[PDB]
């Protein structure tokens, strides 16, 4: 909790926020990231699979706020039908599409339009490895719209047996709330790492600071492995920045 106490983090955030109003070039920048310099190489190959960091104190977003796309296994008739009819998940998704339909309908420039329309992309965990080819490069560089894995039903698999195909609307709704409210990160095999912590004009400076400590606590705690405890060896430094602003230091070792 030392980083919250230090005034350097507060003073940097005030400068970063102040700049975004003054500078025209940063007008479209809305999210605040923290850049972490881990002491040693993580050693985890980038699998493009998001890992969720639970932010206990505060909630980054709610399912209602964002344009959510769902990519389901073929056929999508079962999953689309159950989600749409049930009251809880009726309005939870912008659109529901299958992998094959997504490949056929959207190609070339149509992919770029799909990226702009939707703020969050989620997919059945089974089809996730297929998405990089279908969605294209634009989704899978930069980490702004990486698809999130979700499990449709709580049923588990056993070797030499067949999965029963079910859809639990409450469970699907339950996971999606966790994704939007909590922040997420993607491992890579180096020092550097980027995690979203707040949103301009939505979170006050003290709120953003609390999220930062929650992110640091989860990433450093070895008890949270494999999801957490990935930054071993301490943190040399931490910066704060928007998408296009420069990195402002907030903690140095």
């Amino acid at each position: 909790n030392d980083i919250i106490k230090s005034g350097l983090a507060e003073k940097a955030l005030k400068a970063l926020i102040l700049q975004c109003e003054e500078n025209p070039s940063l007008k479209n920048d809305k999210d605040i990231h923290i850049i972490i310099n881990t002491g040693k190489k993580m050693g985890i190959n980038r699998d493009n699979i998001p890992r969720i960091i639970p932010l206990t104190k505060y909630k980054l977003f709610k399912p209602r706020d964002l344009n959510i796309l769902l990519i389901t296994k073929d056929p999508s008739a079962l999953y689309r039908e159950t989600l749409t009819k049930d009251e809880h998940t009726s309005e939870l998704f912008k659109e529901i599409i299958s992998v094959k339909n997504l490949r056929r309908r959207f190609k070339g420039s149509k992919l770029t339009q799909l990226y702009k329309d939707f703020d969050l992309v989620v997919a059945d965990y089974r089809v996730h490895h297929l998405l990089p080819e279908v969605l294209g490069s634009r989704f899978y560089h930069g980490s702004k719209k990486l698809p999130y894995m979700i499990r449709m039903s709580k049923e588990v698999k056993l070797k030499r047996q067949q999965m029963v195909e079910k859809c639990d609307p409450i469970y699907v709704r339950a996971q999606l709330r966790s994704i939007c409210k909590n922040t997420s990160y993607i491992p890579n095999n180096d020092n550097c790492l980027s995690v979203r912590v707040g949103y301009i004009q939505k979170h006050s400076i003290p709120e953003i600071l609390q999220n930062i400590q929650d992110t640091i606590n989860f990433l450093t705690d070895k008890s949270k492995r494999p999801q957490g405890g990935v930054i071993k060896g301490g943190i040399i430094s931490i910066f704060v920045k928007t998408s296009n602003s420069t990195s402002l230091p907030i903690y140095q070792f």
Binding site: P50, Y148, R151, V156, K157, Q175, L176, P226
Partner: peptide
Amino acid sequence: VKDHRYPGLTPGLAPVGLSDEEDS
């Protein structure tokens, strides 16, 4: 929760809590 096919599931799965399941 683990699926033998797809080891990526065990990391990067949404944590679910009582507050999250409760209706708004």
